[PDB]
Every structure is written in structure tokens, then in C-alpha cells.
Design an enzyme around this catalytic site. Structure first.
Site, PDB file in Angstrom:
ATOM      1  N   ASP B  97     -11.448   8.187   3.986  1.00  0.00           N
ATOM      2  CA  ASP B  97     -11.269   6.747   4.156  1.00  0.00           C
ATOM      3  C   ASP B  97     -12.533   6.014   3.758  1.00  0.00           C
ATOM      4  OD1 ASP B  97      -8.593   5.922   5.438  1.00  0.00           O
ATOM      5  OD2 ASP B  97      -9.190   7.606   6.673  1.00  0.00           O
ATOM      6  N   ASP B 195      -9.291   1.287   2.989  1.00  0.00           N
ATOM      7  CA  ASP B 195      -8.618   0.801   4.193  1.00  0.00           C
ATOM      8  C   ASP B 195      -8.485  -0.724   4.216  1.00  0.00           C
ATOM      9  OD1 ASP B 195      -8.852   3.499   4.795  1.00  0.00           O
ATOM     10  OD2 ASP B 195     -10.041   3.179   6.566  1.00  0.00           O
ATOM     11  N   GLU B 252      -4.792   0.746   0.689  1.00  0.00           N
ATOM     12  CA  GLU B 252      -4.036   0.434   1.886  1.00  0.00           C
ATOM     13  C   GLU B 252      -3.946  -1.093   2.021  1.00  0.00           C
ATOM     14  OE1 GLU B 252      -5.766   0.669   5.815  1.00  0.00           O
ATOM     15  OE2 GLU B 252      -3.902   1.423   6.660  1.00  0.00           O
ATOM     16  N   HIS B 325      -1.757   8.661  11.643  1.00  0.00           N
ATOM     17  CA  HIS B 325      -2.471   8.372  12.886  1.00  0.00           C
ATOM     18  C   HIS B 325      -2.257   6.982  13.495  1.00  0.00           C
ATOM     19  CE1 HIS B 325      -4.879   6.430   9.899  1.00  0.00           C
ATOM     20  NE2 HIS B 325      -5.623   5.880  10.839  1.00  0.00           N
ATOM     21  N   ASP B 326      -1.574   6.098  12.751  1.00  0.00           N
ATOM     22  CA  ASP B 326      -1.248   4.744  13.185  1.00  0.00           C
ATOM     23  C   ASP B 326       0.219   4.562  13.568  1.00  0.00           C
ATOM     24  OD1 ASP B 326      -3.848   3.708  12.676  1.00  0.00           O
ATOM     25  OD2 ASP B 326      -3.331   3.067  10.652  1.00  0.00           O
TER      26      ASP B 326
HETATM   27  O1  LIG Z   1     -10.213  -0.049  11.150  1.00  0.00           O
HETATM   28  C1  LIG Z   1      -9.027  -0.763  11.535  1.00  0.00           C
HETATM   29  C2  LIG Z   1      -7.806   0.065  11.129  1.00  0.00           C
HETATM   30  O2  LIG Z   1      -7.888   0.339   9.732  1.00  0.00           O
HETATM   31  C3  LIG Z   1      -6.831   1.151   9.209  1.00  0.00           C
HETATM   32  O3  LIG Z   1      -7.144   1.363   7.837  1.00  0.00           O
HETATM   33  C4  LIG Z   1      -6.721   2.482   9.950  1.00  0.00           C
HETATM   34  O4  LIG Z   1      -5.658   3.295   9.410  1.00  0.00           O
HETATM   35  C5  LIG Z   1      -6.527   2.206  11.432  1.00  0.00           C
HETATM   36  O5  LIG Z   1      -6.438   3.442  12.154  1.00  0.00           O
HETATM   37  C6  LIG Z   1      -7.700   1.366  11.930  1.00  0.00           C
HETATM   38  O6  LIG Z   1      -7.517   1.067  13.311  1.00  0.00           O
END
Ligand SMILES: OC[C@H]1O[C@@H](O)[C@H](O)[C@@H](O)[C@@H]1O
Ligand SMILES: OC[C@H]1O[C@@H](O)[C@H](O)[C@@H](O)[C@@H]1O
Ligand SMILES: OC[C@H]1O[C@@H](O)[C@H](O)[C@@H](O)[C@@H]1O
Ligand SMILES: [Cl-]
Ligand SMILES: [Cl-]
Ligand SMILES: [Cl-]
Ligand SMILES: [Cl-]
Lengths: 551, 552, 553
Positions: B97, B195, B252, B325-326
Site C-alpha cells: 500500500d 490508497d 483505490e 480487510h475493509d
Molecule cells: O487510511 C484510511 C483507509 O485507507 C484505505 O485505503 C484502507 O484500505 C483502509 O483500511 C484505511 O482505513
């Protein structure tokens, strides 16, 4: 001369006393605005909990700069106006002396930690891995923290952000004394010396024996009641406090009556009075305050009486039921609903008729109570939050841990002072840093002042009695009815005068049959009492009576 | 090979919960190294590792304190290097990430930024006086602006208070991010998931948003999501960094349009390789708030997934996923997690894997791990869940309904320890796990799945094989069939010369197909893969999936 | 004894090459019987006998023609029975190969299977039409599918064309295999090594594999290896057959992971007792092809062997071996086979035998037999080698390159006759040996080794004794020390109150240990075993091995 013997002390916890600017934290200007109220109550000494610059890991007991006011509380000019406003009303200011440890953000530690060759290195306790020991922090986990910058561990008896000062180092000691002179030169009226019997360490740092069912070693006397405490207090007195007209209070968990006689003997020029914990640790199963056990009244009476007898000849006691580290007394030992007012007055009588300097904690005078938040996330105290994690990992249920917090948590004492029945009890116009107890609708300063039968007027009258009734200061003390499980009875006595103090610690009627007491009270008059139309020889539920007998 | 990522299958590891090798209760890198041969045997060729970067763990590693250091509990840099080399030795790849919308408030940039208004890092973040803040809410509850008493100004945080947003308007910040990326790409990592990368273009005037009826906070819309500068920033990043390495980049992007996605993922534009979207992940909700539960309506799911297939098939590319994980675990969310657990998990795998794109398998999906159901909030962990509970309870929602929202949508459903075997704590740890293991581990675990030839594991293994050996799975276009059917998800993959017809029953009821065109194709096709033996031609039994291949 | 196999030391006999008692130049069973006293003197308690079953010998007995018949050159059933009983009379045990992935094409099942598409045995094997075969290569070169003009269909053979693969999807075949197993187990044999037993579950769709650049055949991946039904089949075999006898089972599993082996060897799963892996046999190669040579890198070897130790120490069990009939001889492979042959052989033995598991001693390892270097291909014999030569030569590899590959990895290295003495043909035979004796027999032989008190023989004899008498060798956990060191293989074995520290120099160069933790430990210990007299503590001479034993309170 010895003005502090007849003083009544009011402890302010500034974060929670009065917010004057709407940010949700109490401030110094908030205190200044209540000086006429404290004067009206009749207290003459304010003990102000720390307002020094601090990141607030332990709400000011982790000091980042000893000579700076924390910016949320105000500035030095505002502090000066507080001190002056007190002196203008013939009142006095006592501050906490926090010199067992500093913040890890204090410049001494910022420097100390950088290198083994830094000139502040030996201001704190640094050890290699193989020279640490098995001590635990008072706020959970290990007492040693690794610093990757030098590869060595530093000692912290309290939080990770409260590294302990090395009192073996005379340069540290002199730096502390110079800092004290800064405040004393400003005309403050005294210091409470925080955990001052923790400053003499065994520098060998041996492992302690691990008790059955525990992780960390019992330090014994390897930090508490170490050999050099008297030496350090004498040195401090000679270099600093002897040069000012001030009161000093020694906060000393684990100091014996014998030790306290030494500390408070005026000829030793150490401290003026002791502040002990033996009466604060009886309602526990073992030494761990979170392991609850109901109070057994004879234990309380015996313990408080021992301290009275040990120091009456030429020592002096701090008299207190609660402070910012303890549950609120009406909840702890009284009844906090149907007999809240009555039992609060009883508790006040029992303490104030002893020999010593009484301490009123903010909100005690209006019968503030413990708080019962449904979830951990409304709690704030690092001690409570750390304990939760640790006891949960040891297999205590959520219910059990929450009960321990309800009964012993320090945040009980820290919910904001309840001024009135407006939003947030008039403590703040914003959002408080810690939630106000929702019982402020019943329990508040405005309602107390409007109600002539309130706890406030009773406290005001007790304070007045200390001024007008010489025996309260001059009398010796003797416990009566030592084994009685409901009545706390004792006498104050000089050669031609007696007080007989009779306090019911239960909600059940108690009929006194002891003929010595019944004949004494027949020849006495009532000095103070909390329930009208006394039935002589009976204590109604939570009743307190004091008889005065001259002869 | 050229565009290797098109045929890759990604396995996502949530390192806190995959495998503990030292007994402290948290998963670690050495734990992952111990399972590299298992992963190779499953057949995945890309591991997406969730954050192992130094972090105080406010949001379990998505709050980064040092971008170039390994969090101590996970291991050291040498152990990280052993994982990377271990993957490379097995011709596998490592994707991580890229978390550059925000940092931890403990990151040195923010430590400096917050000190004073004249600090050189002041405009690395968004600092505003009280009368210049707006009415946005944080995604993790409460306001999006937090007061710092050090200067008396507020900083912006779209996520937790310990996740201050970075200011991409500042070119020095952008360059520092690019230099940090090069640190990792120089070590030979094989790509990044970028992300919430469409959140980085803010309207720096920060106007108030409209507050809908019965709400507290203003809708931001384009003032932080899909702002004007995203294409510009992605082009800049590609030119300065990612163009120089043989890597896969995934954007993302919650709420991205297909119009912008066609631009982002066109190789001629040199922005990103593929998109990771959420059109299919918030349909089982009353409206925009995931906690307001509504049962999925199958035609909504089908329309949305198909829209993205059709939009990007010509020259773009989609990430294909059901969970991570989300998200709640897919067999619990859209399948049946008891009497048809294995069958419905196989159905769901078929439905996703026969689409056009790069499939993602979340750890535990391959053995049919399920949602968790703890009695009290005390056993939950996720800041999002804990903050939501507090906010909704204060607003007057019932404890019971809040818990049901957590059971259905809570992120901790995905984060319970991987179930390796039927030993204590499912063989995840010899100590006490950081989050309780799901009690169903005695029946649902990797060992039982490997022993059982009918398991979900072998079905996933086989779908991965088919993607390697069956060209149409990669090269085919897509069309949705039976769009309004409430039970069957039917679609076609097609090249010039051949077709797949994919038929998935999302219900526990038998479905007899009545569509003449599908029935014609069934009649002429052969069965490529199927989850229930002894097919009845033209019928889908409960949770049945069948893929027909037509090559005549 | 409960789990007796944990403390066993296995000695593998390759019967074609062990001892010829009748003078035709091939080893035989009576030849083995004649050496029982010797085997007992060495101290081994389990003999693993490579196949003596009836076989046309295309793969020297791993191509079985009749599972219940002794190959007539080796002897008769009476002589086999005498060997089994002779072992049992000396409290020794016999383990044999279970060869059930394939049979000879001369087996009655295949003779029937191939006759027609509707033969009752047709589906004992894998038959496909031309359009339904795939691109797999045989492990012994060429394609994995062979046309049979009798029916026009192709049969699968992973190994030689005369080794057609059995179809384990057929339950009748499985039951036939189990009945065959019972024939042997009823006679009182003590265990089976299950040959390539993770090859028996095929992907019956037979997909094409990806063809690497500069190759003809598709990589099979896990489309014959590690199929879905292996655990199923092993459990079924265990419950039908092996659970009913007091025997040891070993699973030979190329490509089975540590994870998989944790399942196979967990007693709760009732599959096999121990795993036999190849990961440490495939490190001295440039890629997956053993013939593409690369020198061993010690840290790779240490890491791999340690991974298997740690993975199986809790519940499972490892076979510990350096060599066998499929591998070059270890003193040549990883040791020094010149002046330091004796010392390095002892070092290698110490390194393996102090690990956790069941050690395997290959015939001749205990006297430090070496690899062979024949000048011409005509002196080689193994089908794999001869097939490889042809394939690699047509692929463009030089004659010289291919011969180097044979010298370093060829299986005939292991198969030259056992060197008994310095007489003609090293006393193996009075006839012409089937494969030439290594010319070094004049210096390297059993008689010389027994006469020489400093020989490799006495060192192995003592290591075997140590396993009998030193509990921690069995019960200890394992952890790797000095993992990055390119010369020293150091590790510890540990229990609650005891440790062994094992220090082996894999090089001809003196090594001085500076690691304080090791130096402090070994100061507290005593020397359990060592291969060079007059130790200097903390230093390893060229090819030195030392084991320290450290007892706590
Ligand atoms: O950092 C804020 C959010 O970003 C997303 O890209 C992640 O998948 C989440 O797990 C995270 O809580
Ligand atoms: O700093 C450690 C402790 O010192 C005591 O003197 C204070 O009363 C506590 O509130 C504090 O936590
Ligand atoms: O039969 C095929 C192969 O099987 C293995 O188990 C044997 O050890 C080899 O020697 C043999 O060539
Ligand atoms: Cl310095
Ligand atoms: Cl702490
Ligand atoms: Cl937050
Ligand atoms: Cl062949």
C-alpha cells in the site's frame, strides 16, 4: 508561628475546577473568579494541583518545564494575579513539588537521552539490558524503557513519559533547589512534596521476589523508604525551605508512624506534616487497590487512631478523606443517595474533629459523588486505561474491571466541579475534557448554597469551629469503642476539657450502652451535630454528634 | 512478460492476523515466510501485503509514522528483505500500500508542521483558523477538523484524528513522496496499491457542504473526492517514479466515475494500470451509510459490476474482488455460511473469477472463513467500529441495532486470525491473539481444507489454474445476461471465435432457466468448471455455479 | 517399542550392487544374508531394501512386473524369507519400497488394459485420444504420452515408456493395491517407503503446461504432483492396511511443502510416520533441472534443512539423508573426496546425525565411497542418464558439458558395486559386474576401513551408538545458529535443561568463531563427539566437526 496547624486546606484540581474561556478545561482565571466563594466557605490555604508546563500524560504530574505555566491554564501574569488575589484575602497558596520524576519532554531528559556523554546523562537512571530488574510500573507494565538512541534503559516508576530523577547526583539536587527558589521567591506559601519518600533508590537495582500470581518483583525498600530520604530533606531544608515562611507537606506512601515522627519533628527541620495512605488502602484484598474488599470499620479506626497517637506530642498530620487520586468519600464510605447529605456531614465531622490540618477536596463541600460511565472510553486517567488492558489480559471480566474503576478510579475525583444546573453544570460553555457527572442536576454548588440544610453550610460551620474551639487544635486524641463495627467514637482531651465525637458509619440505628460514654455526654453540651432533636445515647442512621465537656 | 499483471492472481495478506511465529499474539513477517510454499501451492503470483510500516496502529498501519521503517512487532528490515527475496525466488511478486493521502500525527513531518505557523513543514498539511474550517465530518466519525492548542489552528483529517491529511498542493511534499516511493521501488517491490488516491485533490477554499435532512455534517462531493488535479498528480507520479520500474499500479478510488477510470487505466495515458472501485461494496445499505443495513438486491449488484466490466474492457483494467480487510467476509455477506458454506463459497469464487480483470483473494477466503459475532464491543478492535458505536449510541440508536451493523459490516469480521488448524487459537499463535479467533475454527481451517478434496481450497486452486490456461478468461469481452433476475447472476465472456456462459445461483432455491438464448448456449457448450456434480441441464440447484464453454 | 522408528538408523541396500554371492555380476539376496553380521556390527536396526520384485529392470526394479514375486536373478521367495527372518533374529527390521504410482508395461494389469477400450483393466491406467493428451514431458526425457497402435490411444507415463501410471481414481485398483500390501505385511515386513506417493492424484483434465523459452514440454505445475486426493488416499490406505500392523511408513514426496508435511506426518491424521523430501537435494542447480549445475551455497542448505527441522519438530518427523540410489555420493558432492575424504565424510555424518529425525545411511557411505568418472557414456547404465544425454545433446549442450552433469548428478554414481576389499572387482563378484567398480576401490574398501581405527566406519558406528544412548538427539528441538556464515554449519539441539551445540566446517579453510554466545556455551559443555584430535576451543580446522553437550541443573 505554625499558622499551618490551624489552617484548613482546599485542594483545587485546576483542569476540573472552572473553565472561564469555553475550551472545556479549567483554567487559572476560572479559579480567580471563585476566590470570593472560597473565602465565604472559610478556607485559608489553597493547594493547587500542577499548572506547570506538561504534555498531560499524567495531568500535570509529568512536568516539562518547572518554571512555565501550562498554556491552556493561562500565563505567568494570570498565575501572579491568582497568588496576589489569595494574599489580598489573607489566604495562602501551596503548590505540588514534583521532583521524583519529570516528563520525558523536559529538557533535562531530552538531553540525557541523546548520548552516554551528554552532561545531563546522570540526571536519570540508565542501565544496560543485563543491569535492569523485574520492577513493574505503578501504571502497569515494566518499570524500564529501552531508548534505541543509546541502547540503554531508563527507569520510570510511573508512566513511560515520567522518567525518574537521579537524586544520587548532587548537580540534579542543586538544580531542583534552584527551581524551588524560583517559586518561593515569588511568595508561594508552601509545597506538597510528591511521593517524596520514593527518591532514594537502591542503585544496584536487584530483582524483587515475585509474589504468588504476579509478574513483577516486589521492590521492598529498594525505592520506597530508602536510606537517604532524611539526608535529602535536611539538605533541601538547609539550602531552600528554611529561608522562607512556608508550610511543607510530605506525601509518603508506606512511611511508618516511626518514620513520620522523625520527618515531622520540628527539631529535624525536614517537613511540617506528613500525608499518609494507610487509611486509603484498607478496602482492598491485598496491596493492589483494584482487588476490592469492603471496609471493616475497626481497621479504619485503629489505623487513623495510630497516626493520631504517634504524632500528637510533637508531629503533625494531614487530615483527608479524598483528593484527585481517590474515590469521593461520600460514595466510598458514606451513602450517596438517600443519606447523601447526612452521611457527608457525618464523614466531615469524623475527620474535622481529629488533630491535624484538614484538607477539603474540591466538590467534597457539596457532596459530589463517584461517577459510573458505562464504557471505558469515557474514562481518561492513564492509570485506569493501563490497568484495564493489564487486568483484561490477566482474565478479569469486563464487569469486574469496571467495578474496580467505579470503586477506586481516579477519574471519580476529576469529573468537572458541579457549579449549577445549567448545561455541563456551568463548568464550561464548551465540551468538557472529561464528562460531567449527570447527577449535577441534583448535586451542585448553586443548589447547595440555596439549601440551608446543605453540606456546604455544614462544612462552613466546621471550618468556623476550628477557629473558635481551641481544643480541636490543642487536644490529645484517644479511640473509644475500638471494636464496634458501626460507631467511630473518640475523644479529644486536655486536662480540664474533653470532646466526645460519636459517628455512625451505617444506615442502622445504634444504641450506645457503654456507661463511661453515657455519663460523660450527660455533663456535656452539643458542639455540633448533623441530625436535629438528638435522642441522647442513640445514633440514628449516619448520625454524628460532638459533645463538649469542661471541668 | 508484457502486462504480466493482467493474468496475475493477487492474494492479500493482513499481516497482524496471518501468522504469529513468536507467540506475542500478532502476526509477523517471519510468520508469512513460513507460509510462502503454501501460497505458491495455491497458485497465486502476487502478494498484496497490508501495511507493515512503522505506525502507532491507530488504523492498524494505515496511519504511517515512518514510510521507510518496518514496524518493530512485524520484524526488521532484514526480515522484510527475506520475504521479498523469498517471493522472488518462487517467481512471485510483492505489492504494498502507498498511503499518501495522510500520515500518522506522529510522522516527523507533522511533528514539525504542528510546532508553529512558520515551521518549514507547516503547509505539508491543511491548517486553518476556526472561522476558516468547514462542516465536513471524518469518515471515522466526528468532525474532519481537529484543534491544535500549540498554534490554535485546526488540521484536516478525513480519517482518524491521528491521520492528518497531506497537502498535495505543495510541490515539495509531492517530491518527498516520490523520493519515498523510489526507496521501495529501488529495493525491488513489484507495485503499489495507491490508497484512496482520488481523495488527494482538495478544494483549499474548504466551503461548507450541504447538510442533508437529519444529518450533522456537510457533503463534500468534489471538494475532496474526484477533485480536479487527480489526473495531473497521477501523470506526475508516473513520470517521476513508476514509469522507471516494471511494476503494477492499482488506484483505490471510492466514487470514481467510469469516465475518469477509462482515462486512468488507458495504458496510453501512463497513469495507473488498474482501478479498485467500490460500486459493488455499498449496495446492501439504505443509502450512503454502510451501517444502515438493507439486504442486497441482486440486480443492483449485477448492474454495477457489469457497468465496470463494459466501461473498461476495451483498454482499461479492473481489480476483481469480493472482500478485503475493509469488508465483511463474502460467504457470510452474500452466501450461506452454514449448510451451503462450501458450495456457496465456490459459487461466489466462480462468479468473480470468470470476469475480466485481476482477481484478488483475501486471506482466508480460500478456506471459506466467515464473519464473527462477539457479544460485546469489548472484543472488537477497529477504530471505525468503536467510533461509530460511540457516535450512534449518543444519537439514540439502540445497542442491539448498532451491534447488528457491526456484525454485518464491521471491518473486524475480516481481521480475526487466519484459521490454520484445529489446535488452540487455530494454530495462529501459541500466545493470546490480539483479536479473538472465530470459534468456528474447529470446523473451518486450512488443515481440514487441504485434507478434503471437495474443499473450497482446491476449487480456488483450480480457478487460478484456469486463468493460466484458458485465454478467453483474460481476452474476452463481457455482457450481462438476465439483468433483472432476482436469483441468477448470468453473464457471457466472448472473443471473436468463442464464448463462456457463466451461471451462478445466489439463492438457496432451485432455479430452472427459462431464457431461450441461454438454454441454446447451454445445449451446445461443454462444462469448463462447476461446483455441484451431476448437472441437470437448464437448472441451477441451490447455490450452483456452472461455466459453459462454446468453441464449436 | 512405542514409535520405535524415531530412534532407528536405516541402512539402504541397493541389491543389484551390494554383494554378488553366485558370480553372475549382479548382487543378490543371499549376498545380503552373508553380510548380516557386518550390518549388525555397524549397529543399524532397519534395512531399507530397494526393489527385489519381479521387473524387466528398465528402471532397475522400480518398474514392477509382479508385486508378489521375487525377481529370479535376486533369488526365490525362500531366500527372501530367510533374509527377513535373519534380520528379525538379530532384532533388525526390513522396510521395502511401495511402488504404486506406476507399474511395468509387462504387468498383467497393463497387458490386459492395453488390449481394448472395453477391457476390465482399461481404467487401471490413463488412456486418452490424441486430441485429449497434453504437452507434459516424461521425467526420463521425451513426451509423457505414448501411442499404443492396438487401440490408437495414448497412455500416460511420468517415468519411462515402460512405466505406465496407475489410475488411483479407480477404487478397484486401490483395493488391488491394498491387497498386495497385505501380502507383504502379513509376511512380517516392518514398513514401506512410499515412492513418489504425492504423484498419485492427477488433474484428470490434463491441462497443457506453460513451455519455458528454449523448451518443448509444458511445466506440469501441480497437475500431477500435490493433487487434491493424496490425503484421502493415504488415510484410506492407513485405515484399510497399514494401521493393522506394527510398521513404519515413509512418504517420498518431491515438491510437498513443509506445511503439507505437517499434515502428512501428524499422528492424529493417520497418514504416514515421516516425510522424505528433496529440497536439500536440489540446491546445487541453476534452476529446477538438476543437470544445470551450480555450486552449493552453504546458507541455502542450512536454511532449507533448518526449515524442515523447525516445521516438523512439534508433531511431525523427518527422514534425515544425504544420499541414496538417486543421488551422487555425499563426500564427493559436498565434502572433499581427496586428502580430506576421511575427515570431511566424518564432518558430514556429524552434521546430519545430530539433527532431529531418522537417519538413513546409504550403502558405502559408511566407508566414504565416492562418485565415479567414466570417460565414455558406454560405461554408464541408468536409463535417466542415457535418455538425458540424447535429449541434451539434441538441444545443443556440448558432450563435455553433459558428461560434467553426469559426473556431478548421475544416479550411477550411487550404483557402482559396493567396495568390500582390494581383490578383483573389490570382492563384489567373481564375474563381470553389471556396472563397473569405481577404480578407487584399491584404496577405499570395507576391509581397509575395518583395519584402520581412524576410518569412517568406526565414526559411523559411534554416531549410531550415540543415538541409542543420548536422549536429546531424539527429544531435542532444533535451532539454526550463524545462519549467514558461508563456511560453518552451526546449530543447537535443546530441551528444558540440556543443549547440544553442533559446529561443522564445510570448507577446507580454518574458521575462528567470534560469536560470544557460542563461545560462552561451549566453555560450559563437554565434547560429545569430534572428528579431529587436540581441539582448540572456538576454532574449527579444515572440515572439523565438534559437538558440545551442555547440561543445566
Ligand atoms: O487510511 C484510511 C483507509 O485507507 C484505505 O485505503 C484502507 O484500505 C483502509 O483500511 C484505511 O482505513
Ligand atoms: O506523578 C505520580 C503521582 O504523584 C502523586 O504525588 C500524585 O498525587 C499523583 O496524582 C501522580 O500520579
Ligand atoms: O520409479 C521412478 C522413481 O521412483 C523413485 O521413488 C525411486 O527412488 C527412483 O529410483 C525411481 O526411478
Ligand atoms: Cl549530546
Ligand atoms: Cl505508560
Ligand atoms: Cl478518531
Ligand atoms: Cl523411456
Amino acid at each position: 508561628k505554625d499558622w499551618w496547624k490551624k489552617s484548613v486546606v482546599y485542594q483545587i484540581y485546576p483542569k476540573s475546577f472552572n473553565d472561564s474561556n469555553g475550551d472545556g478545561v479549567g483554567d487559572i482565571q476560572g479559579i480567580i473568579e471563585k476566590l470570593d466563594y472560597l473565602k465565604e466557605l472559610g478556607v485559608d490555604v489553597i493547594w493547587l494541583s500542577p499548572v506547570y508546563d506538561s504534555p498531560q500524560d499524567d495531568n500535570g504530574y509529568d512536568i516539562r518545564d518547572y518554571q512555565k505555566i501550562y498554556e491552556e491554564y493561562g500565563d505567568m501574569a494570570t498565575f501572579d494575579q491568582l497568588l496576589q488575589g489569595l494574599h489580598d484575602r489573607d489566604m495562602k497558596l501551596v503548590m505540588d513539588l514534583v521532583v521524583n520524576h519529570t516528563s520525558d519532554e523536559h529538557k533535562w531528559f531530552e538531553e540525557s537521552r541523546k548520548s552516554k556523554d551528554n552532561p545531563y546523562r546522570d540526571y536519570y537512571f540508565w542501565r544496560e539490558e543485563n543491569e535492569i530488574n523485574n520492577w513493574g510500573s505503578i501504571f502497569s507494565g515494566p518499570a524500564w524503557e529501552l531508548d534505541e538512541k543509546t541502547g540503554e534503559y531508563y527507569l520510570h516508576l510511573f508512566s513511560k513519559k515520567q522518567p525518574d530523577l537521579n537524586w544520587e547526583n548532587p548537580k540534579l539536587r542543586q538544580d531542583v533547589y534552584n527551581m524551588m527558589k524560583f517559586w518561593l521567591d515569588k511568595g508561594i506559601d508552601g509545597f506538597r512534596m510528591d511521593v517524596i519518600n520514593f527518591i532514594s533508590k537502591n542503585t544496584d537495582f536487584p530483582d524483587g521476589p515475585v509474589p504468588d500470581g504476579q509478574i513483577y518483583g516486589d521492590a521492598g525498600n529498594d525505592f520506597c523508604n530508602g536510606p537517604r530520604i532524611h539526608e535529602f530533606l535536611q539538605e533541601m531544608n538547609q539550602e531552600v525551605t528554611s529561608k522562607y515562611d512556608v508550610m511543607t507537606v510530605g506525601e509518603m506512601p508506606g512511611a511508618s508512624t516511626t518514620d513520620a515522627q522523625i520527618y515531622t519533628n520540628p527539631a529535624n527541620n525536614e517537613v511540617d506534616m506528613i500525608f499518609t495512605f494507610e487509611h486509603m488502602n484498607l478496602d482492598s484484598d491485598s496491596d493492589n487497590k483494584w482487588d476490592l474488599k469492603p471496609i471493616y470499620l475497626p481497621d479504619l479506626k485503629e489505623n487513623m487512631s495510630e497516626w493520631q497517637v504517634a504524632l500528637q506530642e510533637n508531629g503533625w498530620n494531614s487530615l483527608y478523606w479524598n483528593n484527585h487520586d481517590q474515590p469521593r468519600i461520600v460514595s466510598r464510605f458514606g451513602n450517596d443517595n438517600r443519606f447523601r447529605v447526612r452521611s457527608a456531614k457525618m464523614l466531615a465531622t469524623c475527620l474535622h474533629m481529629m488533630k491535624g490540618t484538614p484538607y477539603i477536596y474540591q466538590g467534597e463541600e457539596i457532596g459530589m459523588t463517584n461517577v459510573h460511565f458505562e464504557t471505558l472510553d469515557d474514562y481518561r486517567d492513564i492509570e485506569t486505561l493501563n490497568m484495564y488492558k493489564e487486568r483484561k489480559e490477566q482474565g478479569h471480566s469486563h464487569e469486574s474491571i469496571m467495578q474496580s474503576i467505579y470503586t477506586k478510579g481516579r477519574d471519580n475525583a476529576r469529573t468537572p466541579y458541579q457549579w449549577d444546573n445549567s448545561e455541563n453544570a456551568g463548568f464550561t460553555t464548551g465540551t468538557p475534557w472529561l464528562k460531567v457527572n449527570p447527577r449535577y442536576t441534583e448535586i451542585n454548588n448553586e443548589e447547595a448554597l440555596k439549601n440551608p440544610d446543605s453540606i456546604f453550610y455544614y462544612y462552613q460551620n466546621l471550618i468556623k469551629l476550628r477557629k473558635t474551639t481551641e481544643i480541636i487544635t490543642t487536644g490529645n486524641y484517644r479511640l473509644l469503642l475500638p471494636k464496634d463495627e458501626a460507631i467511630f467514637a473518640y475523644e479529644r482531651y486536655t486536662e480540664n476539657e474533653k470532646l466526645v465525637v460519636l459517628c455512625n458509619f451505617t444506615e442502622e440505628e445504634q444504641v450506645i450502652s457503654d456507661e463511661t460514654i453515657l455519663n460523660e455526654i450527660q455533663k456535656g453540651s452539643v458542639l455540633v451535630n448533623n441530625v436535629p432533636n438528638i435522642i441522647e445515647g442513640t445514633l440514628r442512621p449516619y448520625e454524628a454528634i460532638v459533645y463538649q465537656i469542661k471541668g
